[PDB]
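idk why but the lab printer keeps eating my pages so im just putting this in chat instead. protein + calcium ion:
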Amino acid sequence: VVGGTEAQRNSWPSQISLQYRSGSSWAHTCGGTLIRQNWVMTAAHCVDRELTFRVVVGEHNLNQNNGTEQYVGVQKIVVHPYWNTDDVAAGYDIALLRLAQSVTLNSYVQLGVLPRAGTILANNSPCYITGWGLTRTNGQLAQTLQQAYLPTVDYAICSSSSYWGSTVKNSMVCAGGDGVRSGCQGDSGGPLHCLVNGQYAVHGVTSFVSRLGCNVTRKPTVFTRVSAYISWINNVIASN
Ligand SMILES: [Ca+2]
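predcted complex ->
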């Protein structure tokens, strides 16, 4: 997250760190949202690589023991069947991971609230992105979980010529674009949390930023729209 502030430890308890095995250690690669005690929602593109993955819940600082983490292997990966790795702009950037164990809930580990199917946020709705992704374009991952305030940009505006044009679809949410704050590499797969009727819900799964840079004016961060996939998510959880 570029232009973020450090999140409080208990603000976003559904955020997870998706990590892969790197020699004798583990490296953060993407975020995710814990949606059941044994299921995580993330981006399809995060799991294209044929890597060994694990999930960390209750994580705050990737580089120090927080005394709250639970580490769990990924047992099954279900990518949306219309996902095409050669075409992020087509959408379908969503995947569900069944965890090898059910995690234990507490102040640091909670299920993410999902929006009702079909919900579309009004332009300029209040949301936060969270994650450990780069803190600058071509920078480095955050140590501590970051958050940034990114108001939505509705479809008519986001898909206009000076923004994302045809690249953005109605199955996506755009947020931000102020030139200062944004998602960045490493935030992919994590939540966009938006306040609706007094309750934060996870309306987006972080998907992509401009090839030109993370914080680019009129290139808001783009998220898979969670409320476009409620039926798909329920069907996967019910059949697995
Ligand atoms: Ca830690």
